[PDB]
Amino acid sequence: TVVEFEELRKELVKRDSGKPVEKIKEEICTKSPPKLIKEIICENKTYADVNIDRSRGDWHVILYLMKHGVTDPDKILELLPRDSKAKENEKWNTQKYFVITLSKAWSVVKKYLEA
DNA sequence: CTGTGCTCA
């Protein structure tokens, strides 16, 4: 689990813009993307704004930051809502949750922008 | 992939 995270996050860090998370929401909220992705980044909502499942609300937001080239485990894990087990640690381990979600979400984007 | 996510089917 943890060793796959080390190689996976290395590929996210080498694709990261190097800017801190405080710039990620700032540069998104000044743009005019669709209300769905913008309102989730620019307000305390996370799924209740679009009435989507909390699993897919996180999935769509994670894919969007990977296309902006600002992906990083620190940003991706911190932006999650209080309804996510990823930071609430209700009972399920967050380390294996991260490896599952990032492995799929990152695989989808990198094959989407490959050349 | 151990809690599931999309896309033209």
Side-chain angles (χ1 to χ4, degrees), chain A residues 55-56 59 85 97 101 103:
Chain A
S55 59
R56 287 186 289 137
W59 172 262
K85 301 177 181 291
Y97 163 87
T101 299
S103 174

PDB file of all heavy atoms in Angstrom, chain A residues 55-56 59 85 97 101 103, chain B residues 1-7:
ATOM      1  N   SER A  55     -18.894  10.229  -3.277  1.00  0.00           N
ATOM      2  CA  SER A  55     -17.807   9.502  -3.912  1.00  0.00           C
ATOM      3  C   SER A  55     -17.489  10.090  -5.283  1.00  0.00           C
ATOM      4  O   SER A  55     -16.319  10.184  -5.656  1.00  0.00           O
ATOM      5  CB  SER A  55     -18.199   8.033  -4.052  1.00  0.00           C
ATOM      6  OG  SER A  55     -19.376   7.919  -4.825  1.00  0.00           O
ATOM      7  N   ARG A  56     -18.523  10.487  -6.033  1.00  0.00           N
ATOM      8  CA  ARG A  56     -18.337  11.037  -7.368  1.00  0.00           C
ATOM      9  C   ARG A  56     -18.033  12.527  -7.316  1.00  0.00           C
ATOM     10  O   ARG A  56     -17.369  13.045  -8.211  1.00  0.00           O
ATOM     11  CB  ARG A  56     -19.573  10.760  -8.219  1.00  0.00           C
ATOM     12  CG  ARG A  56     -19.621   9.280  -8.596  1.00  0.00           C
ATOM     13  CD  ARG A  56     -20.766   9.028  -9.576  1.00  0.00           C
ATOM     14  NE  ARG A  56     -22.075   9.133  -8.915  1.00  0.00           N
ATOM     15  CZ  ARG A  56     -23.133   9.756  -9.439  1.00  0.00           C
ATOM     16  NH1 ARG A  56     -23.056  10.349 -10.630  1.00  0.00           N
ATOM     17  NH2 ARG A  56     -24.278   9.784  -8.765  1.00  0.00           N
ATOM     18  N   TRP A  59     -14.468  12.518  -7.007  1.00  0.00           N
ATOM     19  CA  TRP A  59     -13.858  11.970  -8.207  1.00  0.00           C
ATOM     20  C   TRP A  59     -13.758  13.022  -9.311  1.00  0.00           C
ATOM     21  O   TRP A  59     -12.715  13.154  -9.943  1.00  0.00           O
ATOM     22  CB  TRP A  59     -14.672  10.760  -8.659  1.00  0.00           C
ATOM     23  CG  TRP A  59     -14.292  10.172  -9.981  1.00  0.00           C
ATOM     24  CD1 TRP A  59     -14.909  10.430 -11.153  1.00  0.00           C
ATOM     25  CD2 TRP A  59     -13.185   9.272 -10.303  1.00  0.00           C
ATOM     26  NE1 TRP A  59     -14.296   9.725 -12.168  1.00  0.00           N
ATOM     27  CE2 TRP A  59     -13.226   8.994 -11.699  1.00  0.00           C
ATOM     28  CE3 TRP A  59     -12.152   8.663  -9.565  1.00  0.00           C
ATOM     29  CZ2 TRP A  59     -12.311   8.138 -12.321  1.00  0.00           C
ATOM     30  CZ3 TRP A  59     -11.221   7.817 -10.187  1.00  0.00           C
ATOM     31  CH2 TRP A  59     -11.301   7.547 -11.559  1.00  0.00           C
ATOM     32  N   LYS A  85     -14.257   9.960   4.560  1.00  0.00           N
ATOM     33  CA  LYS A  85     -13.489   9.195   5.541  1.00  0.00           C
ATOM     34  C   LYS A  85     -11.999   9.476   5.374  1.00  0.00           C
ATOM     35  O   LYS A  85     -11.208   9.122   6.240  1.00  0.00           O
ATOM     36  CB  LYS A  85     -13.755   7.699   5.357  1.00  0.00           C
ATOM     37  CG  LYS A  85     -15.240   7.366   5.513  1.00  0.00           C
ATOM     38  CD  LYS A  85     -15.448   5.879   5.233  1.00  0.00           C
ATOM     39  CE  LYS A  85     -16.923   5.499   5.352  1.00  0.00           C
ATOM     40  NZ  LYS A  85     -17.396   5.569   6.750  1.00  0.00           N
ATOM     41  N   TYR A  97      -7.291   4.096   1.079  1.00  0.00           N
ATOM     42  CA  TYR A  97      -8.272   4.865   0.328  1.00  0.00           C
ATOM     43  C   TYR A  97      -7.636   5.770  -0.717  1.00  0.00           C
ATOM     44  O   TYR A  97      -8.094   5.829  -1.858  1.00  0.00           O
ATOM     45  CB  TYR A  97      -9.193   5.646   1.268  1.00  0.00           C
ATOM     46  CG  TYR A  97      -9.953   6.755   0.573  1.00  0.00           C
ATOM     47  CD1 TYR A  97     -11.177   6.478  -0.054  1.00  0.00           C
ATOM     48  CD2 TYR A  97      -9.428   8.056   0.559  1.00  0.00           C
ATOM     49  CE1 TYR A  97     -11.877   7.502  -0.712  1.00  0.00           C
ATOM     50  CE2 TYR A  97     -10.125   9.081  -0.096  1.00  0.00           C
ATOM     51  CZ  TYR A  97     -11.349   8.807  -0.738  1.00  0.00           C
ATOM     52  OH  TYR A  97     -12.026   9.800  -1.382  1.00  0.00           O
ATOM     53  N   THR A 101      -8.141   5.631  -4.912  1.00  0.00           N
ATOM     54  CA  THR A 101      -8.772   6.752  -5.603  1.00  0.00           C
ATOM     55  C   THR A 101      -7.792   7.449  -6.545  1.00  0.00           C
ATOM     56  O   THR A 101      -8.153   7.764  -7.679  1.00  0.00           O
ATOM     57  CB  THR A 101      -9.324   7.733  -4.566  1.00  0.00           C
ATOM     58  OG1 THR A 101     -10.288   7.077  -3.768  1.00  0.00           O
ATOM     59  CG2 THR A 101      -9.981   8.933  -5.246  1.00  0.00           C
ATOM     60  N   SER A 103      -4.968   6.222  -7.820  1.00  0.00           N
ATOM     61  CA  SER A 103      -4.460   5.328  -8.851  1.00  0.00           C
ATOM     62  C   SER A 103      -5.402   5.310 -10.047  1.00  0.00           C
ATOM     63  O   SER A 103      -4.955   5.332 -11.193  1.00  0.00           O
ATOM     64  CB  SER A 103      -4.292   3.922  -8.275  1.00  0.00           C
ATOM     65  OG  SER A 103      -3.924   3.031  -9.303  1.00  0.00           O
TER      66      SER A 103
ATOM     67  O5'  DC B   1     -11.587  -1.132  -5.055  1.00  0.00           O
ATOM     68  C5'  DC B   1     -10.852  -1.149  -6.260  1.00  0.00           C
ATOM     69  C4'  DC B   1     -10.471  -2.583  -6.630  1.00  0.00           C
ATOM     70  O4'  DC B   1      -9.698  -2.570  -7.821  1.00  0.00           O
ATOM     71  C3'  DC B   1      -9.616  -3.212  -5.530  1.00  0.00           C
ATOM     72  O3'  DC B   1      -9.773  -4.620  -5.467  1.00  0.00           O
ATOM     73  C2'  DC B   1      -8.211  -2.886  -5.994  1.00  0.00           C
ATOM     74  C1'  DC B   1      -8.356  -2.930  -7.512  1.00  0.00           C
ATOM     75  N1   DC B   1      -7.410  -2.006  -8.177  1.00  0.00           N
ATOM     76  C2   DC B   1      -6.601  -2.514  -9.187  1.00  0.00           C
ATOM     77  O2   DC B   1      -6.678  -3.698  -9.513  1.00  0.00           O
ATOM     78  N3   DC B   1      -5.723  -1.678  -9.800  1.00  0.00           N
ATOM     79  C4   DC B   1      -5.634  -0.397  -9.435  1.00  0.00           C
ATOM     80  N4   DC B   1      -4.748   0.376 -10.056  1.00  0.00           N
ATOM     81  C5   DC B   1      -6.460   0.150  -8.403  1.00  0.00           C
ATOM     82  C6   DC B   1      -7.334  -0.693  -7.805  1.00  0.00           C
ATOM     83  P    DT B   2     -11.099  -5.320  -4.847  1.00  0.00           P
ATOM     84  OP1  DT B   2     -11.027  -6.765  -5.160  1.00  0.00           O
ATOM     85  OP2  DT B   2     -12.289  -4.542  -5.260  1.00  0.00           O
ATOM     86  O5'  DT B   2     -10.920  -5.157  -3.249  1.00  0.00           O
ATOM     87  C5'  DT B   2     -11.347  -3.984  -2.585  1.00  0.00           C
ATOM     88  C4'  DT B   2     -11.166  -4.141  -1.076  1.00  0.00           C
ATOM     89  O4'  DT B   2      -9.796  -4.399  -0.782  1.00  0.00           O
ATOM     90  C3'  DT B   2     -11.563  -2.834  -0.379  1.00  0.00           C
ATOM     91  O3'  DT B   2     -12.219  -3.065   0.856  1.00  0.00           O
ATOM     92  C2'  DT B   2     -10.220  -2.180  -0.120  1.00  0.00           C
ATOM     93  C1'  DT B   2      -9.312  -3.383   0.077  1.00  0.00           C
ATOM     94  N1   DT B   2      -7.905  -3.051  -0.234  1.00  0.00           N
ATOM     95  C2   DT B   2      -6.963  -3.229   0.771  1.00  0.00           C
ATOM     96  O2   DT B   2      -7.259  -3.651   1.890  1.00  0.00           O
ATOM     97  N3   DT B   2      -5.656  -2.902   0.451  1.00  0.00           N
ATOM     98  C4   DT B   2      -5.216  -2.410  -0.766  1.00  0.00           C
ATOM     99  O4   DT B   2      -4.027  -2.145  -0.935  1.00  0.00           O
ATOM    100  C5   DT B   2      -6.263  -2.253  -1.756  1.00  0.00           C
ATOM    101  C7   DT B   2      -5.923  -1.718  -3.128  1.00  0.00           C
ATOM    102  C6   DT B   2      -7.548  -2.577  -1.470  1.00  0.00           C
ATOM    103  P    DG B   3     -13.748  -3.585   0.918  1.00  0.00           P
ATOM    104  OP1  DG B   3     -14.161  -3.624   2.341  1.00  0.00           O
ATOM    105  OP2  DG B   3     -13.864  -4.809   0.093  1.00  0.00           O
ATOM    106  O5'  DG B   3     -14.582  -2.412   0.185  1.00  0.00           O
ATOM    107  C5'  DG B   3     -14.879  -1.198   0.846  1.00  0.00           C
ATOM    108  C4'  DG B   3     -15.720  -0.302  -0.062  1.00  0.00           C
ATOM    109  O4'  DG B   3     -15.933   0.954   0.574  1.00  0.00           O
ATOM    110  C3'  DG B   3     -14.986  -0.036  -1.383  1.00  0.00           C
ATOM    111  O3'  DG B   3     -15.887  -0.018  -2.471  1.00  0.00           O
ATOM    112  C2'  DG B   3     -14.443   1.365  -1.183  1.00  0.00           C
ATOM    113  C1'  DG B   3     -15.526   1.980  -0.312  1.00  0.00           C
ATOM    114  N9   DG B   3     -15.015   3.158   0.422  1.00  0.00           N
ATOM    115  C8   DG B   3     -13.901   3.254   1.212  1.00  0.00           C
ATOM    116  N7   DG B   3     -13.695   4.449   1.699  1.00  0.00           N
ATOM    117  C5   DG B   3     -14.755   5.201   1.196  1.00  0.00           C
ATOM    118  C6   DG B   3     -15.068   6.582   1.372  1.00  0.00           C
ATOM    119  O6   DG B   3     -14.459   7.430   2.023  1.00  0.00           O
ATOM    120  N1   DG B   3     -16.220   6.939   0.691  1.00  0.00           N
ATOM    121  C2   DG B   3     -16.989   6.080  -0.054  1.00  0.00           C
ATOM    122  N2   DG B   3     -18.077   6.595  -0.622  1.00  0.00           N
ATOM    123  N3   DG B   3     -16.706   4.786  -0.229  1.00  0.00           N
ATOM    124  C4   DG B   3     -15.576   4.413   0.423  1.00  0.00           C
ATOM    125  P    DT B   4     -16.478  -1.384  -3.093  1.00  0.00           P
ATOM    126  OP1  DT B   4     -17.401  -1.991  -2.109  1.00  0.00           O
ATOM    127  OP2  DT B   4     -15.354  -2.179  -3.644  1.00  0.00           O
ATOM    128  O5'  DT B   4     -17.351  -0.821  -4.320  1.00  0.00           O
ATOM    129  C5'  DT B   4     -16.726  -0.357  -5.497  1.00  0.00           C
ATOM    130  C4'  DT B   4     -17.676   0.591  -6.225  1.00  0.00           C
ATOM    131  O4'  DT B   4     -17.864   1.757  -5.426  1.00  0.00           O
ATOM    132  C3'  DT B   4     -17.085   1.043  -7.557  1.00  0.00           C
ATOM    133  O3'  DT B   4     -18.135   1.301  -8.475  1.00  0.00           O
ATOM    134  C2'  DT B   4     -16.341   2.308  -7.175  1.00  0.00           C
ATOM    135  C1'  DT B   4     -17.181   2.853  -6.017  1.00  0.00           C
ATOM    136  N1   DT B   4     -16.371   3.590  -5.009  1.00  0.00           N
ATOM    137  C2   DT B   4     -16.961   4.709  -4.437  1.00  0.00           C
ATOM    138  O2   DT B   4     -18.121   5.035  -4.679  1.00  0.00           O
ATOM    139  N3   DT B   4     -16.171   5.451  -3.573  1.00  0.00           N
ATOM    140  C4   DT B   4     -14.862   5.171  -3.230  1.00  0.00           C
ATOM    141  O4   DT B   4     -14.249   5.923  -2.476  1.00  0.00           O
ATOM    142  C5   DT B   4     -14.335   3.961  -3.828  1.00  0.00           C
ATOM    143  C7   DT B   4     -12.920   3.535  -3.514  1.00  0.00           C
ATOM    144  C6   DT B   4     -15.097   3.209  -4.661  1.00  0.00           C
ATOM    145  P    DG B   5     -17.835   1.826  -9.970  1.00  0.00           P
ATOM    146  OP1  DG B   5     -18.932   1.359 -10.850  1.00  0.00           O
ATOM    147  OP2  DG B   5     -16.431   1.497 -10.311  1.00  0.00           O
ATOM    148  O5'  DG B   5     -17.966   3.421  -9.817  1.00  0.00           O
ATOM    149  C5'  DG B   5     -17.639   4.274 -10.897  1.00  0.00           C
ATOM    150  C4'  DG B   5     -18.046   5.711 -10.573  1.00  0.00           C
ATOM    151  O4'  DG B   5     -17.509   6.124  -9.324  1.00  0.00           O
ATOM    152  C3'  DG B   5     -17.492   6.654 -11.634  1.00  0.00           C
ATOM    153  O3'  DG B   5     -18.366   7.741 -11.842  1.00  0.00           O
ATOM    154  C2'  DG B   5     -16.202   7.162 -11.034  1.00  0.00           C
ATOM    155  C1'  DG B   5     -16.327   6.884  -9.540  1.00  0.00           C
ATOM    156  N9   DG B   5     -15.137   6.154  -9.051  1.00  0.00           N
ATOM    157  C8   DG B   5     -14.455   5.121  -9.640  1.00  0.00           C
ATOM    158  N7   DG B   5     -13.431   4.695  -8.951  1.00  0.00           N
ATOM    159  C5   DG B   5     -13.421   5.522  -7.829  1.00  0.00           C
ATOM    160  C6   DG B   5     -12.518   5.559  -6.725  1.00  0.00           C
ATOM    161  O6   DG B   5     -11.549   4.836  -6.510  1.00  0.00           O
ATOM    162  N1   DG B   5     -12.842   6.563  -5.826  1.00  0.00           N
ATOM    163  C2   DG B   5     -13.902   7.428  -5.960  1.00  0.00           C
ATOM    164  N2   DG B   5     -14.057   8.344  -5.005  1.00  0.00           N
ATOM    165  N3   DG B   5     -14.761   7.394  -6.984  1.00  0.00           N
ATOM    166  C4   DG B   5     -14.459   6.421  -7.884  1.00  0.00           C
ATOM    167  P    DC B   6     -19.408   7.747 -13.072  1.00  0.00           P
ATOM    168  OP1  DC B   6     -20.403   8.815 -12.831  1.00  0.00           O
ATOM    169  OP2  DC B   6     -19.861   6.355 -13.306  1.00  0.00           O
ATOM    170  O5'  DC B   6     -18.471   8.192 -14.301  1.00  0.00           O
ATOM    171  C5'  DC B   6     -17.961   9.511 -14.364  1.00  0.00           C
ATOM    172  C4'  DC B   6     -17.146   9.720 -15.641  1.00  0.00           C
ATOM    173  O4'  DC B   6     -16.015   8.859 -15.632  1.00  0.00           O
ATOM    174  C3'  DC B   6     -17.987   9.397 -16.877  1.00  0.00           C
ATOM    175  O3'  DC B   6     -17.808  10.402 -17.856  1.00  0.00           O
ATOM    176  C2'  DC B   6     -17.424   8.072 -17.351  1.00  0.00           C
ATOM    177  C1'  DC B   6     -15.990   8.122 -16.840  1.00  0.00           C
ATOM    178  N1   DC B   6     -15.461   6.764 -16.594  1.00  0.00           N
ATOM    179  C2   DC B   6     -14.432   6.303 -17.405  1.00  0.00           C
ATOM    180  O2   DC B   6     -13.972   7.018 -18.294  1.00  0.00           O
ATOM    181  N3   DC B   6     -13.945   5.053 -17.194  1.00  0.00           N
ATOM    182  C4   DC B   6     -14.455   4.286 -16.228  1.00  0.00           C
ATOM    183  N4   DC B   6     -13.951   3.066 -16.065  1.00  0.00           N
ATOM    184  C5   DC B   6     -15.507   4.742 -15.376  1.00  0.00           C
ATOM    185  C6   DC B   6     -15.978   5.989 -15.595  1.00  0.00           C
ATOM    186  P    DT B   7     -18.937  10.695 -18.974  1.00  0.00           P
ATOM    187  OP1  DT B   7     -18.607  11.987 -19.617  1.00  0.00           O
ATOM    188  OP2  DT B   7     -20.266  10.507 -18.347  1.00  0.00           O
ATOM    189  O5'  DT B   7     -18.725   9.527 -20.066  1.00  0.00           O
ATOM    190  C5'  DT B   7     -19.540   9.486 -21.225  1.00  0.00           C
ATOM    191  C4'  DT B   7     -19.029   8.439 -22.215  1.00  0.00           C
ATOM    192  O4'  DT B   7     -17.734   8.812 -22.659  1.00  0.00           O
ATOM    193  C3'  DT B   7     -18.937   7.053 -21.571  1.00  0.00           C
ATOM    194  O3'  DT B   7     -19.385   6.032 -22.449  1.00  0.00           O
ATOM    195  C2'  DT B   7     -17.451   6.882 -21.322  1.00  0.00           C
ATOM    196  C1'  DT B   7     -16.828   7.755 -22.404  1.00  0.00           C
ATOM    197  N1   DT B   7     -15.520   8.303 -21.976  1.00  0.00           N
ATOM    198  C2   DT B   7     -14.402   7.978 -22.735  1.00  0.00           C
ATOM    199  O2   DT B   7     -14.468   7.270 -23.736  1.00  0.00           O
ATOM    200  N3   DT B   7     -13.194   8.497 -22.304  1.00  0.00           N
ATOM    201  C4   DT B   7     -13.007   9.310 -21.201  1.00  0.00           C
ATOM    202  O4   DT B   7     -11.883   9.721 -20.916  1.00  0.00           O
ATOM    203  C5   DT B   7     -14.221   9.599 -20.462  1.00  0.00           C
ATOM    204  C7   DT B   7     -14.156  10.478 -19.233  1.00  0.00           C
ATOM    205  C6   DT B   7     -15.415   9.094 -20.859  1.00  0.00           C
TER     206       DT B   7
END
